[PDB]
Amino acid sequence: AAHRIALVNVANHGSVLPTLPVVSELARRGHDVGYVTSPEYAGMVERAGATAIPYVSGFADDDPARPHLLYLAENEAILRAAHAHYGEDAPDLVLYGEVPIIAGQALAAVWKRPACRINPGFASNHVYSYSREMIEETGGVDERTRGVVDARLADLLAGYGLRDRAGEFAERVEDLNLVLIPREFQIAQDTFDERFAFVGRSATWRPPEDGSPVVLISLGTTYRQCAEAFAGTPWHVVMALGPLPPNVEAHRWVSLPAVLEHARLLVTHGGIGAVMDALTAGRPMVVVPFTFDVKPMARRVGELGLGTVVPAAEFTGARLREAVEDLAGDRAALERVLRMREHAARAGGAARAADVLEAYLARER
């Protein structure tokens, strides 16, 4: 019937924003969702239909162990808020993000409850692992750093009598995983078994009236060469970032899905949220990967022929203008993107995610 869900997640846009349609679907079906989040995202998750569970947390600085210790501190802070909020009456399911996996698994073990991981982007297994690729890009781990982190993890789990489970919590694959991308976009997709549900994602501005082709440019946290590149061209350029030609439009923030309804191409930094937006809109994209985290997405857009990858080292105004006009007139790419849009629509979205989560709790797994 109506279940109790503890949605345990880290509090940032990339983690919280994609989970909100799932929260809404569950809430609409009458499920009591408790969202462990920070006070800044508390109103956001409550407007989505959840009950906010706030969490707040406050040696060396250059230390390579510092990011891992802060990660464990956040996992501890999350774990404390959830455990204290529910107390004696445990929820029916532990829905946790692909970042607080120590907190999520500890809670599930303590409460003796089924758990489910939420992967907004790529899912990881023995064949492909977005985490293993991420760890190497962040420089990997030395033996000294491994010892520091391995101990503080065991110390963290000791307070819940789970010290002997540090190894599995860090390495194991969850019994169920909601993956917020279509199966067809996933790297080594045919290797992902029954434990992964590829449900994809569920879903003010006026365009030029003359009929000018529109290109949306939304890159990272890095806006002059782009405007100078499309100057004198028939393109209408919509730019997002935090002297312009008449055809170039600039805004601090832009609704990517709203503009993509009128634009034929997206110039993106490679974020899975933006890639998913283009895919849902059926628009090819030009990916410029400035950060390491988007490198798998950039590689995947390229190998599926859903767009063009311009390396950050090779990026100039001219190369962008060249990539945009080349990919815009490419019928082959457009057909592949529209086909990928059908896959994304067929994924099931938040409605199927809820159907999957209900099926899981029906003691079917």
Oligomeric composition of the shown chains: monomer
CATH architecture of the largest domain: 3-Layer(aba) Sandwich
CATH topology of the largest domain: Rossmann fold
Q: How many independent structural domains? A: 2
**CATH class type of the largest domain:** Alpha Beta
The helical percent reads: 40-55%
String of helices and strands: EHHEHEHEHEHHHEEEHEEHEHEHEHHH
Please state the CA-atom Rg, rounded to the nearest Å. Answer: 22 Å
> Can you count the helices?
15
Categorize the overall geometry. globular
Largest sheet: number of strands, sense, barrel closure: 7 strands, parallel
CATH homology superfamily of the largest domain: Glycogen Phosphorylase B
Beta fraction of the residues? 15-25%
Number of strands: 13
Helix-strand category:
alpha/beta
PDB class: transferase
Keywords: glycosyltransferase, enediynes, secondary metabolites, Structural Genomics, PSI-Biology, Midwest Center for Structural Genomics, mcsg, Enzyme Discovery for Natural Product Biosynthesis, NatPro, oxidoreductase, transferase
Assembly: monomeric
Entry title: Structural analysis of EspG2 glycosyltransferase
